From a paper:
The cryo-EM structure of MexY reveals that this multidrug efflux pump forms a homotrimer and adopts the overall fold of hydrophobe-amphiphile efflux (HAE)-RND membrane proteins. Similar to the assembly of many other HAE-RND pumps, the cryo-EM structure of MexY displays an asymmetric, homotrimeric architecture with the pseudo-threefold axis positioned perpendicular to the membrane surface. The conformational states of the three MexY protomers assembled to form this trimer can be assigned as “binding,” “resting,” and “extrusion” states, where the periplasmic cleft established between PC1 and PC2 of the "binding” conformer is open, but the periplasmic clefts in both the "extrusion" and "resting" conformers of this pump are closed. The MexY pump constitutes a large, spacious substrate-binding cavity deep inside the periplasmic cleft. This cavity, compartmentalized into the proximal and distal drug-binding sites, is surrounded with several anionic residues, such as E129, D133, and E175, and aromatic residues, including Y127, Y613, and Y659. Within the “extrusion” protomer of MexY, the cryo-EM structure indicates a similar tunnel, where it vertically connects the opening situated at the ceiling of the central cavity up to the exit site located at the bottom of the funnel region of the MexY trimer. Like the extrusion tunnel of AcrD, this MexY extrusion tunnel is surrounded with charged residues such as D100, E129, K130, D133, R166, E169, K173, and E175. In addition to the extrusion tunnel, we noticed a formation of a horizontal tunnel at the “binding” protomer of MexY. This binding tunnel allows for the interior of the periplasmic domain of the “binding” protomer to be exposed to solvent via the entrance site of the periplasmic cleft created between subdomains PC1 and PC2.
It is a major determinant for resistance to aminoglycosides in this opportunistic pathogen. MexY is also able to confer resistance to a range of other antimicrobial agents, such as fluoroquinolones, macrolides, tetracyclines, spectinomycin, chloramphenicol, and cefepime. This efflux pump is an inner membrane protein that works in conjunction with the MexX periplasmic membrane fusion protein and the OprM outer membrane channel to form the MexXY-OprM tripartite efflux system. It constitutes substrate-binding sites and utilizes the proton motive force (PMF) to export these antimicrobials out of the cell.
Author numbering:
A (entry chain C): 1 to 215, 231 to 251, 257 to 1031
B (entry chain A): 1 to 1031
Amino acid sequence: MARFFIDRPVFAWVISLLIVLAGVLAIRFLPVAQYPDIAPPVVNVSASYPGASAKVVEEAVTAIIEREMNGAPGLLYTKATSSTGQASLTLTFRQGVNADLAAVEVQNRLKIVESRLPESVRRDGIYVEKAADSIQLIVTLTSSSGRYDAMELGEIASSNVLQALRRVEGVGKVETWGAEYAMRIWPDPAKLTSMNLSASDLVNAVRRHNARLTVATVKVDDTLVTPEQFGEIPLRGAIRLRDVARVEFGQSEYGFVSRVNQMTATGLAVKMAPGSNAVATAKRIRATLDELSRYFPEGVSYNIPYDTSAFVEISIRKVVSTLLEAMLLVFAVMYLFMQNFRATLIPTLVVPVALLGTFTVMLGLGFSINVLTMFGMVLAIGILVDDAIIVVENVERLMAEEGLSPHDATVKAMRQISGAIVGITVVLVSVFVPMAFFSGAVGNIYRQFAVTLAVSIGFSAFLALSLTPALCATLLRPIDADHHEKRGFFGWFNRAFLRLTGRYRNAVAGILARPIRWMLVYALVIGVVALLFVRLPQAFLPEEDQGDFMIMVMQPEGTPMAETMANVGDVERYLAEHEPVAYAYAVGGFSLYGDGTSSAMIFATLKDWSERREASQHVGAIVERINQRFAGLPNRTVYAMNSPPLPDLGSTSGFDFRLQDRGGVGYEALVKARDQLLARAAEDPRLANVMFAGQGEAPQIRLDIDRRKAETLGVSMDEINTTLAVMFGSDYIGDFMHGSQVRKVVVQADGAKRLGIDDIGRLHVRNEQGEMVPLATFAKAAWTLGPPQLTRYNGYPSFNLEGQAAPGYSSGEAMQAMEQLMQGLPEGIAHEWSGQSFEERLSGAQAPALFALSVLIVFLALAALYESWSIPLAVILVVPLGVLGALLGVSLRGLPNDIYFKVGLITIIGLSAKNAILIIEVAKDHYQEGMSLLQATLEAARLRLRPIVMTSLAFGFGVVPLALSSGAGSGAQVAIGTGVLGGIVTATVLAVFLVPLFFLVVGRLFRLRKA
Amino acid sequence: MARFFIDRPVFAWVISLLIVLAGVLAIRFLPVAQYPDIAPPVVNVSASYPGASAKVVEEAVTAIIEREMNGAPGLLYTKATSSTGQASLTLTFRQGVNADLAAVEVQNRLKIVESRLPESVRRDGIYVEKAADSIQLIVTLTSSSGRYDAMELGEIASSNVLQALRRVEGVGKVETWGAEYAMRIWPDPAKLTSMNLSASDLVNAVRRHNARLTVGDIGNLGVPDSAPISATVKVDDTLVTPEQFGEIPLRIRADGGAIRLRDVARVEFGQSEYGFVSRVNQMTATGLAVKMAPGSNAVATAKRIRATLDELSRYFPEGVSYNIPYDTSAFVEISIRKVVSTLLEAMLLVFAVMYLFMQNFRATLIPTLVVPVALLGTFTVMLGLGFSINVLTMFGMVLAIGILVDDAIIVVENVERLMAEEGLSPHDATVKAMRQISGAIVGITVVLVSVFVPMAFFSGAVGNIYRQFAVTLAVSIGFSAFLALSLTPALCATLLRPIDADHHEKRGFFGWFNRAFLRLTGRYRNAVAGILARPIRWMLVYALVIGVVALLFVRLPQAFLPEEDQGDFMIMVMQPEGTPMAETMANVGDVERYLAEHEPVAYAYAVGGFSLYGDGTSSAMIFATLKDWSERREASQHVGAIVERINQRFAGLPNRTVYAMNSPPLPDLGSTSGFDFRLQDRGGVGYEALVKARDQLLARAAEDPRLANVMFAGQGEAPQIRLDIDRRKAETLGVSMDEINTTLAVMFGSDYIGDFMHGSQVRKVVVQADGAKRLGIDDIGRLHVRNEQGEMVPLATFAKAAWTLGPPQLTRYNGYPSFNLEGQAAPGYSSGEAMQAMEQLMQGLPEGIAHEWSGQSFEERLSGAQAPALFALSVLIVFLALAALYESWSIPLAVILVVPLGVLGALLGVSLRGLPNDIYFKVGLITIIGLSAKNAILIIEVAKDHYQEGMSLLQATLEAARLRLRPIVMTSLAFGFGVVPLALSSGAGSGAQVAIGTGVLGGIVTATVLAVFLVPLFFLVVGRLFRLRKA
């Protein structure tokens, strides 16, 4: 199609302009994130059973819900945890299903068995949510004036900040943590002993008293549901202000302890709406917070102690800068060689248009701009530059070597290269597309953009076959005699390169003269590539310094909120002393529990990477100082999540072993079996570190209820629960503490401070008649060592076991070994692989199959291009040369065989394949002219030397910055750099000295002949 | 293309290899199903109202829910089954509606009307499952020996098998036909009355104790104050043992609450399901039904079910083995396999014919290479379009083979002509021949595709079926055309060697064949000249042929799809309602022993308490899987004869009426093998009047010869206690709440206090009154409803026994009371004829009684309407395409005139073997019309060329026929041989192949014999009448 566009420059210009406009609009509309969503759709079901035993919770809430959920469409697996007071059922759904529809179905299935569940949970209501536990940005309002209560600050936030943030563009939810104003019934612990508490009766009286008219403008506007109104409501001396309530309550609604750098604030979490540019949304939030800060009564200073958007923005900046600098370097190299400003301008114009077309296609398919997208964009710009530069170089050499006018030179050059261009486009497509077939969306994105960037070279089949030929036909002007080659650096460089080309041709002739030796050298290259590939660790994503670290203080099942705050303060002080933390906002609860008193979350934002340049000031080293040194206390399990990777799914050899099947075996029996299995796994060499992730059994106490005696007596079982409520009892609620606002009322013995332990099996219980009779007479409290949380997998109480494969042992091999080690365990116990293990069990041989398919397709396409069944074999043989350099560089650097490295290796393969195809095509053309194989090969090597050198130099120098990255996203950049740079260097040199040898060998072997 | 691919053989080979690889991958990814997916989205809303009769359930649950759902988007039709104690609502939505979204809408409407439903119904829960109503798979846990009893096997299945079966993808509903091992309590109404204790109060106390006890939130979390010990007191009073359930306290007297459950009830950890008795091959085993969700492939789902069962067996307790006694998809798999083998045989036969004619291995080889490439490309296109690997698509490929070879045959023959006559090099000969024949190839392909174009425009499920076949065939033909323009030219340019020096007609049998064909050609030339001598006579003969075609097509009966030997059937053993389960299973065992003794039955699963007609103690069904078709190759051992023998063996048994049916064809469309008829009652004529109309219609069906085995699916009325509760009395007495009435009714039925933790899972707690006491005639009268004030107010105050004959269940089809009248087509009468006979007899029934067809019958009526118009449109399109091809408005008329001969052949073929006008027949008719038109083109084009050259019209026709005898015979013979295995198929899937092959074979046979003697006549007559100009 080149001839058409060469004749119609305005046509090609129009096509390019359309592409550019589409790209601009696509960038305007494209979603932006750090990483694309890869996690399978997951539905979280949460329920709260106030004051319920973990075993009780498992028996009623967990089991029924889990059993009913079985049958939902595409329910890949079900995991359930039964803690005390609450239960969580994570339902992992197979990929391809819409999370929203799955959530609706889950809600309906919950409705099916709503009645069976206990009434208290029914009041609380089962909460179903699509798994989106991504708090991207956090806003906190500290007491700037030092005169604002935590609940007061929270009131200011909810009144103003809450709604405005909800209205802000791209905000999924703005859930809050700040403490509120709820009442807390605070009776003495002798209330039952002196007269009676019977708080159930008076709370029921509270609910009954609060009433509204049922019939129409007439209504009642009288309702007393407040601490002050509790002296006016009948609270059943007895309990009231008029009766004896005395100690009312305190701390309002005690909640998440929010301290921004040891300064009280209000917890206001924010999550980005899925599909919205995080950076731009952050900007919106910032402006809105400025306005609201001006609103604030000069005590509500807004602080951002956490914003993931910053790292996303800086990484995108790094990539975009890399693109711009690469274009600049391409300009530099093309000026160095061509020495014609217009010729320099041509590819500098062509390349961005193809990039914009890639952007358009990306928006069309729905792929979102992410660090993977942009990082691979930097991979294919070199390939983008390569095709434009080879086209324009072929055009200009004809203008120089011959006297063809720009139009004629363009026509002849396109006649020479066009078919090769088509073939190369097809080959690159067939080498990049197979990456999509992987069940990893990482590879899918790294495909889609790279595929449409080789089809940006296909847009170049509408540009480098349409626009670039047109531009060369018009922008290029005939060489000004030899004025382009003066006595300056440019001219000397040109002459020197001519001398170098002569030397190179002589060396290539020498190599061809003794083919056997150099083919043996190539076989040695194969061996070296193999051995380097073997001695290389495997990884999925290189972690980087996000600029923030998360700490969780796990403490014994329940610790006094004062004690938890003490430990939090200790951690915060340690961070403020020996760590470079810009903001160290601390929030109680949260962590794994979500509101657990023992649990505590520390969101600590590091300083700028510039001041933390020292390796000891890297997030890895900073987290290393935490979790030990200061941390590591026996009871105080303070662990810092070391920059949790945004795709929290990468696992090299993690084994999600689940001893799910109970088959009736007691919990004790399952514990025994778990111990035996983990010991044997440790013994077996195929297996590596094996742990029981479940928390070890903690000390506890049980109370065998005197239910039989309560049958004999007037004491009801609910009366026994009420007596517990008197002494060890809470979590009920009230309503309308402040107007329409619904708050809670909680009974607490001896006001706030009960200070009682011997209350266990000691308190008396007045019967239905009212006679004081200790339930301890027949009910007994006994010390125990029960488990903290009960985990059930797929409807079977399970012991989640996490293990890795031993060094050098295959992950699947180790999984088979795990199964065999289990084999022989007591009957009723079985295994069920989950997560990475489950997916691997489903299919793990996709990679070799699609690689072989890609090789076959490439061979067939090359056979079509060369019109022979033998010539492509050389192009196939070219491949390992590029791999050699990537392996060498990654080995010297010490970086692992990460996804970045693999994709860069594929890109290097593509570049070297393009160069080889060009070389061999030109050599074949010369041979078909009549020139002997040797001489034709030498001529092709001479001709296809300068474009290859220019391509390699430009791309390598563009990649060098990434290979020398300094923090702020350094990991991924250096992986990509190292890989691509090594591949480029070795690929280029070995190619220009071996591909002629390959063609010569094939020609001699298969007796290639003229047409 | 032609010259391009000729000059670059490597490129052509590369393209073909790419197509082959794509086909291989597509086959690897293509789904497999017997018939193209035609299942409409269906959602079954099931509810239970224990202690309520069919009338009570109808008026309290089914009516309200049906009214609410009425008006939903899509919702093609609504089927309501108000059984006694259970409500069923099958809502069938229109094809294409998102099943999940429809289910969501149903859930929303259920939410709307939930507040008006009985509270007990809410407690039981309304299960809205997007499932079908046909038991595709059965899983039976057989004990090795008496290690596990029925209850043990049922519990094991529920603990492990049930959840995993529900977990697999594609399953819609897993019915349980075993036991649940749930706490069974048996309160004595006599004892309760003697102690003046209401059963509801007992239920309340049991639920009270069953409820798990709780604690507070002080001493562990928040502010535990001085709690260094965890001291999170773990409630230890939950009751599991039946003794503990007995211990539950009841009304406490002055002496004490000595009255417990044990005093007035029998507590035992027995099974909860007493209404299902399952035996596999006369071996007691628990059973779990599996109904595939609509939209599932139902083969891969079966495979994954088998894999999951394998793993569970790996973890089964010693002595438990899973077994599948009834699988529908196995026939699908084996039939697809057989069709593939038939395709291979057809390829071999076509190769044989082409070698017999060309007599050169390479020239014969080229089309043989062409065939599979086109087939694989068609497979890839099918994958792109979503067409699954179906019997019709595979039929399309099998028919395609012979329609694909011909193009390559023509190309090769032209290349041979030029290479030999003009002494051209294979390259040059190929180039010139391709230059001359490319347009002809493209045109012929276009006409062929045109003939199939309208058949893709059918509507409905038959629309999908015809579309799949037609598109498959058309794509195959298009690929053949492309290959004949790309691959075949290259192969002829390179593979074809120059004609062997002095080719002495390949002396031998080939030489004899050539000489005999030359003599036959002379005789044929003389015959054609004789026909042309007196054109009027032979044209009159052709008009007579048209009349014969019309007569035959009128006589031919119309049907939907031929029945096949599925290899599995179902024996509905019906007993009078109320018949004890024990003797019902005894009769079922009699039937099973008869099966084992005489019939070739591999597996005979027998379940008592389940039937398509209804679920009851009398109801029973035997899912029997036959032995392999190879062992049952004898006609007497085919499924039909077996079913007839079973029916006759247990005929004349009103005490135990036994009816055997074959597995319903197209199970997705309908669950009834015979045509399904709904006798709805639009007008308020009345239930009794509807009964009278039903009986009258059934008598008419019995006397009508065209109808057989026409009966009411629902069981007859049984004498039952018609306990009525006005519930206004409940208002006056102070109860003012049906909840206590509901508790008493479910005490008569099955009351559930709640659930208790058992072993690893949670089992149920049931309180059913003792069997003898429960069946007590005046137990309801003697019992007292607990008043709101606790008063033992006599339940008889608003209880009226009033024993009366009552229907066991009620059916409301499309919001109208209806009676399901299933019927079978009598021998010698097609399904369409049987349905029309049912309609004719329906005329004369009283007003307000409306006839209706559902399932396959509805689709059959829909298919019948649109059949002729699309065929006429096919004829029109073909005529216009030919007119374009010949660049005249006269010449195409002859090619159109050719069609009736092929139609005659198809009609004769089906008439001789008694095959009705089914879907396969119409498909074969379309294909035959196409190929006959192709041959007519082949002859007429040469005739036209000769005429315009200067040869006289008669001379032109004669010479064209002489030159075309060999190609026409070759192509027709290739196609015919390719279709031969279909007509001669025997085994699983034999019926479909026999139908289509018979039609196509007859058509092609006449579309050649009649063609070679009338197409020249047609050309001569047209040339004379329309004065064809020599231009």
